[PDB]
Write a protein that binds this ligand. Structure first.
Ligand SMILES: N=C(N)c1ccc(NCc2ncc(-c3ccccc3)[nH]2)cc1OCc1cccnc1
Ligand SMILES: *[C@@H]1O[C@H](CO)[C@@H](O[C@@H]2O[C@H](CO)[C@@H](O)[C@H](O)[C@H]2NC(C)=O)[C@H](O)[C@H]1NC(C)=O
Ligand SMILES: *[C@@H]1O[C@H](CO)[C@@H](O)[C@H](O)[C@H]1NC(C)=O
Ligand code: NA
Length: 227
């Protein structure tokens, strides 16, 4: 997250980290059900461990942390790697979470956030771009939803309704390492960190996010079919 701030501790209880062996941050993810995560479908590598209720990037012990294994990883059937469309995937945890102040699911609303809506994006991705610099703790940044017309103008012939643009201010954006992390608007999960431009936070190059309001039926039906 470029030019965000340290999240307040215990404020993003739906934030997850997908780790590679032994505890290498791979992608962000979001707890959407007591036994399921959403992440970007481009976060394809086999996950070693899911880490929840944890603030720091390092493996330092935190009383609120909960570790899991992914047992199912279901990308949206419309995703076709390396294309950006339908950039979402459901991950089933090996067991249901233990509900705490640090570990709590967030719901996806079918209401699509409108242009100008203020949303919060979070992640442990680089805080600088092009220079790679990881933070010590979870970073939070407010970004505003752009109209689909302004999104199309920024990325001509690269945008469809499965995506939304957000983040109108130069110097502020999500970036590499933030992939699959949450975009929360008015208390509900409406986006996943998907893609954008390089270096991150360029003027007139907003971040591109998976438009989750378009997938509530798929999310609900897939969780139900795999229960
Ligand atoms: N500027 C942003 N808001 C932004 C946010 C997240 C990401 N995530 C990385 C990422 N998304 C998708 C892929 C991918 C897809 C298919 C095949 C292999 C890889 N990789 C990238 C972002 O901007 C582009 C970017 C690229 C490289 C270095 N820095 C920024
Ligand atoms: C993102 O925006 C929200 C909403 O404007 C900010 O939260 C507000 O913060 C102040 C207190 O510091 C108060 O106006 C409210 O109590 C907060 N509102 C809500 C909805 O929580 C938040 O600080 C911003 N975060 C960042 C990282 O900029
Ligand atoms: C970082 O963001 C804040 C607003 O959140 C802004 O006031 C500040 O100028 C930005 N910093 C840079 C270096 O762009
Ligand atoms: Na900062």
């Amino acid at each position: 997250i470029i030019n965000g701030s340290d999240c307040d501790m215990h404020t993003q209880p739906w934030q997850a980290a997908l780790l590679l062996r032994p505890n290498q941050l791979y992608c962000g993810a979001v707890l959407v059900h007591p036994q399921w995560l959403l992440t970007a479908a481009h976060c394809r590598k086999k996950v070693f461990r899911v880490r929840l209720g944890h603030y720091s990037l390092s493996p330092v012990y935190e009383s609120g942390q909960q570790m899991f294994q992914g047992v199912k990883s279901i990308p949206h059937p419309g995703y076709s790697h390396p294309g950006h469309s339908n950039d979402l995937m459901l991950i089933k945890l090996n067991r249901r979470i233990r509900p705490t102040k640090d570990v709590r699911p967030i719901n996806v609303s079918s209401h699509c956030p409108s242009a100008g809506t203020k949303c919060l994006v979070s992640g442990w991705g680089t805080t600088k771009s092009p220079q790679v610099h990881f933070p010590k703790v979870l970073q939070c940044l407010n970004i505003s939803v752009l109209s689909q017309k302004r999104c199309e103008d920024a990325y001509p012939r690269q945008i469809d309704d499965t995506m939304f643009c957000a983040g109108d201010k130069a110097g502020r954006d999500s970036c590499q390492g933030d992939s699959g992390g949450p975009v929360v608007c008015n208390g509900s999960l409406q986006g996943l960190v998907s893609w954008g431009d390089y270096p991150c936070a360029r003027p007139n190059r907003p971040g591109v996010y998976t438009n989750l309001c378009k997938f509530t039926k798929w999310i609900q039906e897939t969780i139900q079919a795999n229960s």
